[PDB]
Amino acid sequence: XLLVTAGLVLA
Amino acid sequence: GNPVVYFDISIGQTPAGRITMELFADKVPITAENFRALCTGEKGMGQSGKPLCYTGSFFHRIIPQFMIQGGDFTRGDGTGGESIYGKFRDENFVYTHDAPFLLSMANAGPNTNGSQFFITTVPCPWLDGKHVVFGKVLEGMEVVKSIEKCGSQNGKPTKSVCITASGV
């Protein structure tokens, strides 16, 4: 999807 | 009252210009101070053995019609970064992602703020209550748009986007 993570980018 | 900081940006080897940002230290003082100090580099060397500073780091993940993400000055790929504090808690969710050109913290879940951040290029309300919004772009909106156009659906930039200088 549209997330803003740090390490495991998800959907 | 609110600090104003800047990034000078190169796209490839070509200076693109400057993004100038207001930090909402009045409402989000801990989060704003972390970002301000990482722009100046004034806290010096960090726990990762690298300068606590955005200078030289890249926008490593760029998604058109979503946002531009940077601030990983320790690993350069989204797996690193560190705050001046050594992760920190989500300070508050006073501000919402209701506009493009807002600055907000990337994280790896609740209370995991480090140095990574993003500048929105669309409203991102699905992120409200999960990412701490702490400032906005004052000038250099067109530079953000130029960075955004360097994005991809998998987030990998099509051209490197470097913060060649940062500070107050």
Side-chain angles (χ1 to χ4, degrees):
Chain A
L2 298 176
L3 300 190
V4 196
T5 71
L8 307 178
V9 181
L10 309 176
Chain B
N2 279 339
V4 169
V5 294
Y6 68 85
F7 296 147
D8 292 330
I9 300 295
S10 282
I11 305 178
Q13 65 189 338
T14 307
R18 164 173 294 198
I19 295 162
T20 291
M21 294 154 285
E22 178 176 358
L23 316 170
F24 305 148
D26 70 323
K27 302 293 196 84
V28 65
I30 296 175
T31 309
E33 174 61 14
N34 177 54
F35 190 89
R36 191 200 62 79
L38 290 174
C39 288
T40 65
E42 68 194 60
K43 307 302 183 168
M45 297 300 286
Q47 287 182 346
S48 65
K50 283 160 282 270
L52 288 169
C53 191
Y54 285 138
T55 284
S57 73
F58 292 80
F59 284 83
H60 66 269
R61 172 165 178 273
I62 301 170
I63 300 170
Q65 280 67 53
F66 175 22
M67 64 73 237
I68 72 168
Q69 175 182 359
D72 183 357
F73 56 83
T74 70
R75 303 267 278 199
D77 64 2
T79 67
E82 69 165 307
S83 81
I84 59 163
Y85 308 124
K87 73 209 173 150
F88 61 107
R89 291 179 226 110
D90 297 315
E91 192 170 9
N92 67 50
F93 299 104
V94 162
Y95 293 105
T96 67
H97 302 77
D98 65 351
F101 313 114
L102 294 171
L103 271 163
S104 181
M105 293 303 290
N107 57 51
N111 309 308
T112 57
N113 302 290
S115 52
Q116 295 182 59
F117 64 90
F118 54 112
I119 294 165
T120 60
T121 57
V122 298
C124 296
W126 60 95
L127 304 177
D128 296 353
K130 305 202 299 159
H131 294 270
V132 177
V133 178
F134 66 94
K136 65 184 194 189
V137 181
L138 288 184
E139 186 155 340
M141 287 77 66
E142 192 46 47
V143 177
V144 169
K145 294 303 275 172
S146 293
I147 299 175
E148 180 189 23
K149 277 189 310 171
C150 286
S152 279
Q153 66 181 46
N154 77 359
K156 183 192 304 310
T158 59
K159 202 167 213 54
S160 291
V161 178
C162 187
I163 302 170
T164 67
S166 70
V168 285

